[PDB]
């Protein structure tokens with residue numbers, strides 16, 4: 211099973227990807243997580259994203275396309291995968307189409323802009339696994355600790371309010387057109403498209419998605 215998650219920054223894609231990964235046994239491909247990992251480890255493929263993410267700008271299509279191709283070519287992706295934050299632009303989506311990377315579901319997370327800022331300020335992350343929590347809306351079982359490893363959670367470096375707003379502007383300019391892109395694909399029978407209300411509680415969004423995936 212191959213899935214794309216579409217949605218604005220902070221819409222909850224990473225949150226719901228964990229449940230889909232757990233239940234269907236497919237790896238999460240989060241280009242944001244992969245880029246931050248490459249910066250932290252100084253990997254030749256990705257370390258260039260340091261200054262770009264710090265400026266709250268998008269990374270070149272060329273770099274993330276290469277990262278995704280490398281990641282997809284791994285053993286754990288022959289049985290499907292979930293794309294989280296990719297594709298982010300029309301060229302990235304065209305790059306998948308050119309490579310024959312068809313997908314079974316495209317799932318759009320609808321969240322009003324006005325909710326994004328308050329979500330990000332409360333976000334806490336477990337960098338090794340990409341698991342994310344919210345101190346108010348989705349807290350860990352123990353404050354400041356990852357539910358899985360018990361390790362101390364951190365805050366992402368690019369989560370200042372000004373940076374979130376810059377990322378939302380880029381989303382609407384560059385990424386929102388993917389709604390129509392994949393709606394057209396679904397109308398041609400190439401994928402299943404579904405829009406979910408991302409303002410519901412986490413467990414309810416999970417249930418709505420479970421009803422789609424089966």
Ligand SMILES: Nc1ncnc2c1ncn2[C@@H]1O[C@H](COP(=O)(O)OP(=O)(O)OP(=O)(O)OP(=O)(O)OP(=O)(O)OC[C@H]2O[C@@H](n3cnc4c(N)ncnc43)[C@H](O)[C@@H]2O)[C@@H](O)[C@H]1O
Nearest residue numbers: 219220221222223224225241242269295298333343344347
């Ligand atoms: N393909 C690409 N091309 C170019 N550049 C790329 C790229 N991919 C990455 N990059 C670069 O990398 C940077 C970061 O990318 P990325 O890592 O993708 O971050 P982002 O774009 O800011 O999106 P988020 O990860 O913040 O949103 P999310 O949907 O995962 O929300 P989450 O589940 O965390 O939830 C957010 C918060 O809300 C909470 N929450 C979740 N669900 C709910 C709910 N139902 N109710 C209440 N709160 C909730 C969570 O607890 C959490 O605290 C970009 O700026 C870009 O430069």
Ligand SMILES: [Co+2]
Nearest residue numbers: 223224240242
């Ligand atoms: Co995310």
